[PDB]
Amino acid sequence: SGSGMAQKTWELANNMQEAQSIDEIYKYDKKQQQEILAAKPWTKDHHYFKYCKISALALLKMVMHARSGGNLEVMGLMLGKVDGETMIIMDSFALPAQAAAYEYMAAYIENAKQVGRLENAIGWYHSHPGYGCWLSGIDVSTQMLNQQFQEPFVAVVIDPTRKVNLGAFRTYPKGYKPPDEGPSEYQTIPLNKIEDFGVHCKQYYALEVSYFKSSLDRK
Ligand SMILES: Cc1ccc(-c2[nH]c3ncccc3c2CCC(=O)N2CCOC[C@H]2c2nc3ccccc3[nH]2)c(-c2ccccc2)c1
Numbered sequence: 001s002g003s004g005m006a007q008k009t010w011e012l013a014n015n016m017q018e019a020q021s022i023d024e025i026y027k028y029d030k031k032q033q034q035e036i037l038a039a040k041p042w043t044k045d046h047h048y049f050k051y052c053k054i055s056a057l058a059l060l061k062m063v064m065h066a067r068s069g070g071n072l073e074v075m076g077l078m079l080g081k082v083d084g085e086t087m088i089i090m091d092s093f094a095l096p097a098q099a100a101a102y103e104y105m106a107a108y109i110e111n112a113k114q115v116g117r118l119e120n121a122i123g124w125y126h127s128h129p130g131y132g133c134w135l136s137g138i139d140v141s142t143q144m145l146n147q148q149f150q151e152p153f154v155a156v157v158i159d160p161t162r163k164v165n166l167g168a169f170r171t172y173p174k175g176y177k178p179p180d181e182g183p184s185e186y187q188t189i190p191l192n193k194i195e196d197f198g199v200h201c202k203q204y205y206a207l208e209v210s211y212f213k214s215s216l217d218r219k
């Protein structure tokens with residue numbers, strides 16, 4: 001008796017509680033992010049960030065944008081958040097210009113908020129078509145200014161021509177000297193680029209890149 005109505009009430013309760021849970025998770029993520037941003041542990045430890053988790057969706061969009069440029073470098077902005085020593089990249093958008101970059105950034109955050117996901121500006125990406133993942137002279141100077149003004153901010157470099165050719169980097173501040181050596185993995189770079197590479201290779205380091213697939217990103 002009233003078994004049918006009970007089942008519909010049960011389904012309604014599950015749906016109403018799921019909606020409340022998503023809202024509480026969003027609000028908890030927001031406060032947590034605001035707290036991490038107030039503490040700024042990265043301003044004291046120059047090697048604080050060590051990991052970079054990239055969604056398949058952000059990767060798909062970045063590779064498509066990088067491929068579309070051909071032999072020309074392209075760039076865009078990335079959305080995500082901080083989780084300890086890990087920089088999370090959840091989404092990205094192609095560029096194109098400053099006001100336009102501001103208005104898209106605001107639109108992507110609102111769109112994610114509607115589906116209960118917290119994200120903000122986390123970095124920039126650009127392509128090195130046919131010459132590997134590293135920071136050039138202009139990239140090192142741009143990323144140093146970013147780690148003073150746009151902080152927390154990561155520099156992603158993609159080489160769409162050749163395996164998973166993506167690098168995530170963090171510069172060292174002016175005057176700071178890191179300890180010992182760090183050539184990491186091998187990368188073949190053209191001879192006409194090797195000097196610019198060498199002149200700036202100790203002014204930054206690489207984050208440990210990993211990839212993830214979100215439930216919302218299963219599209
Ligand atoms: C703030 C900043 C700092 C450094 C760079 C950058 N890092 C690099 N690493 C290797 C070789 C070069 C670079 C450039 C500069 C590359 C460029 O200047 N261009 C690309 C080819 O096309 C003409 C031109 C360009 N300038 C644009 C301005 C707005 C929109 C598209 C644009 N393309 C960029 C950048 C990167 C890619 C595309 C656009 C800007 C932006």
Ligand SMILES: [Zn+2]
Nearest residue numbers: 128135136139
């Ligand atoms: Zn570059």
